Design a protein around this ligand. Sequence first.
Ligand SMILES: NC(=O)c1ccc[n+]([C@@H]2O[C@H](COP(=O)([O-])OP(=O)(O)OC[C@H]3O[C@@H](n4cnc5c(N)ncnc54)[C@H](O)[C@@H]3O)[C@@H](O)[C@H]2O)c1
Ligand SMILES: NC(=O)c1ccc[n+]([C@@H]2O[C@H](COP(=O)([O-])OP(=O)(O)OC[C@H]3O[C@@H](n4cnc5c(N)ncnc54)[C@H](O)[C@@H]3O)[C@@H](O)[C@H]2O)c1
Ligand SMILES: OCc1c(F)c(F)c(F)c(F)c1F
Ligand SMILES: OCc1c(F)c(F)c(F)c(F)c1F
Ligand SMILES: [Zn+2]
Ligand SMILES: [Zn+2]
Ligand SMILES: [Zn+2]
Ligand SMILES: [Zn+2]
Lengths: 374, 374
Amino acid sequence: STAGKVIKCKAAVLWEEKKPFSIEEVEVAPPKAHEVRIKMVATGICRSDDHVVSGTLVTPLPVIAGHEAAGIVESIGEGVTTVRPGDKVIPLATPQCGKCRVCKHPEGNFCLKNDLSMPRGTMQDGTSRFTCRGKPIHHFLGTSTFSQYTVVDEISVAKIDAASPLEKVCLIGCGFSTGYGSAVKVAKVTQGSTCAVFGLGGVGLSVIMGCKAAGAARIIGVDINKDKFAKAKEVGATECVNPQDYKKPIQEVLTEMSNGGVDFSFEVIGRLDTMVTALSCCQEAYGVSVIVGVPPDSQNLSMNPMLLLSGRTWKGAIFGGFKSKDSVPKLVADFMAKKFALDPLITHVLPFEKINEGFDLLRSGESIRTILTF
Amino acid sequence: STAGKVIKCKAAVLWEEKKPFSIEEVEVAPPKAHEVRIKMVATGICRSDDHVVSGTLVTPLPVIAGHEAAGIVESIGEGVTTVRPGDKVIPLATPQCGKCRVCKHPEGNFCLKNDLSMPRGTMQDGTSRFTCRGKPIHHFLGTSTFSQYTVVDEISVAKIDAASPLEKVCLIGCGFSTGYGSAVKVAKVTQGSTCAVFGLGGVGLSVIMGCKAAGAARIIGVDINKDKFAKAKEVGATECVNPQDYKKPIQEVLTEMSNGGVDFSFEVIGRLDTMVTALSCCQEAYGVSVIVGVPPDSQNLSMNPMLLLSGRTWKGAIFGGFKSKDSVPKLVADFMAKKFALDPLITHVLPFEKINEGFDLLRSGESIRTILTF
Ligand SMILES: NC(=O)c1ccc[n+]([C@@H]2O[C@H](COP(=O)([O-])OP(=O)(O)OC[C@H]3O[C@@H](n4cnc5c(N)ncnc54)[C@H](O)[C@@H]3O)[C@@H](O)[C@H]2O)c1
Ligand SMILES: NC(=O)c1ccc[n+]([C@@H]2O[C@H](COP(=O)([O-])OP(=O)(O)OC[C@H]3O[C@@H](n4cnc5c(N)ncnc54)[C@H](O)[C@@H]3O)[C@@H](O)[C@H]2O)c1
Ligand SMILES: OCc1c(F)c(F)c(F)c(F)c1F
Ligand SMILES: OCc1c(F)c(F)c(F)c(F)c1F
Ligand SMILES: [Zn+2]
Ligand SMILES: [Zn+2]
Ligand SMILES: [Zn+2]
Ligand SMILES: [Zn+2]
């Protein structure tokens, strides 16, 4: 068959920053002990993948990017117990080793085996499974889903329901779960509360979905692209505001709208200025602000700590606070049980070969999530 | 009687920054509607009073400072219902109006009638009850307790047990309650956790008391004055560290000591740099850091928001998160019942007339709390 053998397949290789992806043939080694080789079925285009192209996020190149996906197990290495050939799976960009102090903590999810804090771009064993034109190619976040086949560590993959539609549930691999959990789990939005959400992309829409599910009475969407407002209202924004329409800074506008500050605010963009704005707009004695967006590499923000001394809480999270391997199958089960919707996030579905076109739709403001199909 | 009449008495007036207090005769007007005139019995010297002298904390001058105190009601104005002449009371530097959105919120305590955010240095009605040399003198935080008699708004005073020892319980009016609440109420320190406390003055000692009460396993005190370590261990610190002993920055030292970051850290000094260090030293995925110290006026800190995105929570609070008028009598009742100790905080006692000597003791690093007696 293909098990135990090198696979030659198509992938999208990023050779350098700020260039289009190159679609070409790569060789994918078979999985070693505690590794899983996956035939991809669908992958989403997340703004974080674009951060790798833009240099906003630094990771070793050349690289196969992509992290929000779903596929089917082709083969397993020795010692693998949690998935089998033929299983539907979602790769986990935040792993769950189950052994580190974070995995063992009731509230921690940022497993210490992650490849985000100090990226190496390899498997856990420090080597790569990918070659292209005779050269080794790096992995990204232990996932690398812009390829017909990938290899992942077992701690970076979850088995999901055999009947799930992979072309939708790939979003549970990153953007949906990130936004929804940021609201319900990280902020712990309360019934009757007022919320402000900065950035109305796939992730911000998912934060709105969570705020609405948590029973917020008011959800104010904030974006400089007013074409984003109709969909934000559809998924539960009660009002939308464009900072460019006001003479005053938007923190002041939001503080006035909310009669002295909002209960919960969320930065879902990745800009330092909006992080400080979002903080400021929450009520000074009991407000909570959650950073979800990823800002550029190695840049510090400036703020007045009196913002905090009066009582505000400021926090951030990766992947909505969800312990990844425990939560992903449950979220897919909840989707199958119609507990939330994913279609509002999906604006375009393209063949994999049109990856560059998909990125152009995101950069231009025209898409939310484009799903690529293999 | 003195009821309805101007009282001539002694107070400590601050005519300008960076100068000694002037002990001299002032005129104290009678209380107007919903105001209370108090005969002071004891007041503590808190670092925040020194911040007024140094210009760290900006409030209008000339001023009668002092905010941590206890006394006996001399008279009440029209419509006062919560205290009576002869009652023992503690002035409340953070009011509790009971009517604003913060007072009604289950968590909030920084009442919107406070005089900290936009200091006026007046009574609630925008006027002063103090004259000296024929000139109006400002109030401080609606309390002004460096005077034989003061006048406070009813929302800034709590009745307390008639049998309580005023020369002790005055510390419930600021430093004790602030440190203790910061640990038990704001951080919500958990049993078996590791805590780091930056600054071992009267408030940092009360944070240690709180961490110990909450069942922390390890409580690491941090101070550049090693003379502070013996009392910090007496009240519950398990280890103390002086950053000046180390080649590496103290956040790295604490991260290594706690095998990857502490559960709860507290900044109890008032420096921008230690606020960021304290955040950094808590574990990146589930650590909590609370700012207690008062920063220098109008100065911003610089920080990397990746510290938050991994999962840290960062918050601050006034007065330990306690709703002031509800909480102060209960804290006094608990002191009377021996639920916590105040004596460890009291290192010096002086007559009021020796207030400048009490400030010299604070500035030299020799004292924790000096209590002044009228
Ligand atoms: N924390 C996590 O685990 C995690 C997971 C996924 C994505 N992210 C990050 O979340 C962010 C959002 O991702 P996405 O996929 O939704 O991106 P996106 O590009 O689809 O949406 C961002 C939105 O922000 C808006 N925007 C841009 N500048 C703005 C400004 N100054 N003011 C207000 N709105 C502004 C854009 O118009 C857009 O609608 C990114 O930074 C991404 O890297 C984080
Ligand atoms: N949030 C509130 O409600 C509230 C209430 C009370 C006091 N405060 C503030 O809390 C702070 C502490 O008050 P206090 O009365 O305990 O003061 P304090 O001056 O007695 O104690 C501060 C301690 O910090 C130490 N310190 C100084 N610089 C240091 C450094 N670089 N590293 C480590 N330690 C250092 C000093 O040696 C001292 O022991 C002050 O800023 C004060 O204004 C805040
Ligand atoms: O530097 C990259 C980087 C991130 F993009 C994060 F979101 C994060 F939490 C982190 F710790 C990190 F190191
Ligand atoms: O005149 C304005 C003014 C006041 F309203 C005061 F309350 C005060 F203390 C003071 F010194 C002053 F100048
Ligand atoms: Zn782990
Ligand atoms: Zn993503
Ligand atoms: Zn109030
Ligand atoms: Zn004080």
